[PDB]
Design an enzyme around this catalytic site. Structure first.
Site, PDB file in Angstrom:
ATOM      1  N   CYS A   1      50.185  41.111  37.008  1.00 39.07           N
ATOM      2  CA  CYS A   1      49.432  39.943  36.582  1.00 39.07           C
ATOM      3  C   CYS A   1      49.825  39.700  35.146  1.00 39.07           C
ATOM      4  O   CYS A   1      50.343  40.588  34.482  1.00 39.07           O
ATOM      5  CB  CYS A   1      47.929  40.212  36.677  1.00 39.07           C
TER       6      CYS A   1
ATOM      7  N   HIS B   1      49.608  46.759  37.499  1.00 37.13           N
ATOM      8  CA  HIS B   1      48.626  45.771  37.099  1.00 37.13           C
ATOM      9  C   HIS B   1      49.159  45.390  35.749  1.00 37.13           C
ATOM     10  O   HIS B   1      49.913  46.152  35.140  1.00 37.13           O
ATOM     11  CB  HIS B   1      47.232  46.374  36.897  1.00 37.13           C
TER      12      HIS B   1
END
EC number: 3.4.22.60
Lengths: 235, 17
Positions: free
Chosen positions: A132, A90
Site C-alpha cells: 500500500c 504492507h
C-alpha cells in the site's frame, strides 16, 4: 534515431530478490497477508523462467531487508545483465513494512546508485513493489552518467492508495503481472509488459467485500522509469 | 479511530472474490 536495447549478452540475466513478508510483530498490529505466499510462489516461477536467479527471504525485519539489499549491491554483477528486487509487504507512501516496523524504500534502492554499485552501471535495476502507499480507495466511474539513472519501479498502486489482494488468488498487481510475463515475458519490452499489466488490474479486477465501504473498488498501478534504453529478457 | 480505518491501516481489508 533509432537507438535501442540494453545489452543482454551476459552469462547471467541477473539476480532477483523476493522479500515475502506475511507475518508482522504484535507491536505493529498489522494483519497477516494471507495469499502473499501464493504471490511469491507465482513470482518465483516467472522470474525463474525469465532467467533470474531467484531467492525468497521470508518475514524480514527492517534491518534484515536493509542489510539484504546492501550486500546485494556489494556482490559482483559484471557477468549479470540486470538486477531485480520484488517487495511483498504492507506499506505506506514512501515506505514498506518489515516484521519490525517501517522502512523508507528510498534507502532500500539507494544502495544501487551508479556510484555505490559499479558492477551495475548502465544496467537496469528493477524494483517491483507490492504494498500500500496509503489507505485511499478508487471508488469508480462510468562520458559520465547520472547516479540516479537506469532504475525502474513497478508499484502495484498509485501514491496514497490501497493495494488489493485476494487471500486465495493473491494480490491484484502480482496476479496480473505473472499472467503477462507468462504469455509475453520473453516477447515484449518492459514498458509494454508493465502497460498491459496496468490495463488488467484496471479492467479485470474490482473489489468485493460484504462491508459496503470497500465494495466494487478499483486500482491502477504506477510505473516509474529512469531506464535509458529498451529492455527485453531475450538476447 | 473508525473501525473502517482500523482494517485499512492494519492492511486487513481484502478482495474476498
Amino acid at each position: 534515431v533509432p537507438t535501442y536495447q540494453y545489452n543482454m549478452n551476459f552469462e547471467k540475466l541477473g539476480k532477483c530478490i523476493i522479500i515475502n513478508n506475511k507475518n508482522f510483530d504484535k507491536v505493529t498490529g498489522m494483519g497477516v497477508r494471507n495469499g502473499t505466499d501464493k504471490d511469491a510462489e507465482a513470482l518465483f516461477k516467472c522470474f525463474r523462467s525469465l532467467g533470474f536467479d531467484v531467492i525468497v527471504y521470508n518475514d524480514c525485519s527492517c534491518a534484515k531487508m536493509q542489510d539484504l539489499l546492501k550486500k546485494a549491491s556489494e556482490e559482483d554483477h559484471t557477468n549479470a545483465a540486470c538486477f531485480a528486487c520484488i517487495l511483498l509487504s504492507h506499506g505506506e507512501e514512501n515506505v514498506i513494512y518489515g516484521k519490525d516496523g517501517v522502512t523508507p524504500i528510498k534507502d532500500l534502492t539507494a544502495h544501487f546508485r551508479g556510484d555505490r554499485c559499479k558492477t551495475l552501471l548502465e544496467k537496469p535495476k528493477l524494483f517491483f513493489i507490492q504494498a500500500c502507499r496509503g489507505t485511499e480507495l478508487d471508488d469508480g466511474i462510468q562520458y559520465k552518467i547520472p547516479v540516479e539513472a537506469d532504475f525502474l519501479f513497478a508499484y502495484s498502486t498509485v501514491p496514497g492508495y490501497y493495494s488489493w489482494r485476494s487471500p486465495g488468488r493473491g494480490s491484484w498487481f502480482v496476479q496480473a503481472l505473472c499472467s503477462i510475463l507468462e504469455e509475453h515475458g520473453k516477447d515484449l519490452e518492459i514498458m509494454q509488459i508493465l502497460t498491459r499489466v496496468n490495463d488488467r488490474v484496471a479492467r479485470h479486477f474490482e473489489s468485493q467485500s460484504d462491508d459496503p465501504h470497500f465494495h466494487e473498488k478499483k486500482q491502477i498501478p504506477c510505473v516509474v522509469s529512469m531506464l535509458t534504453k529498451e529492455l527485453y529478457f531475450s538476447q | 479511530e473508525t473501525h473502517a480505518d482500523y482494517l485499512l491501516r492494519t492492511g486487513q481489508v481484502v478482495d474476498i472474490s
